[PDB]
Symmetry: D2
Subunit: 43 residues, 4 copies
């Protein structure tokens, strides 16, 4: 069943890649929100 | 000040685009987790 | 072995619960961003 | 109008709090995915 384990592994690896994509996208959003809050004060 | 508002709007629009990107990525993660739960069951 | 499976299933279910938590939180953020964009316009 | 800005600030603060909630939840999902990948290998 090495077949079964590498199939489960490929799937977990995929989920882990989407997790990293989510985190990097959230980090950019945090930066933009902070800039938005400074821009609202400059006004 | 049209200047100010159009700059605030550009930033909110960017945040809304990242919000959509996060949601589509999370929808794909849900699909993959569901398939992982069925693959685990099968064995 | 079903011991192994129940442990794997408990972990996947936990990940699925966090996935739902992320999606509901993102849905609230989308609504707030839309209201922010309407508030900016009104001014 | 001072309260135009405090309304906008309140809304941005709320979005930033949801952003932190998303990141914390995602950091927990990453840890659990990593443990799942180790548990699958134990098999």
């Amino acid at each position: 069943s090495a077949r079964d384990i590498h199939q489960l592994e490929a799937r977990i690896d995929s989920l882990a890649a989407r997790n990293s994509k989510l985190m990097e996208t959230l980090k950019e959003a945090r930066q933009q929100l902070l800039a938005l809050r400074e821009e609202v004060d400059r006004l």
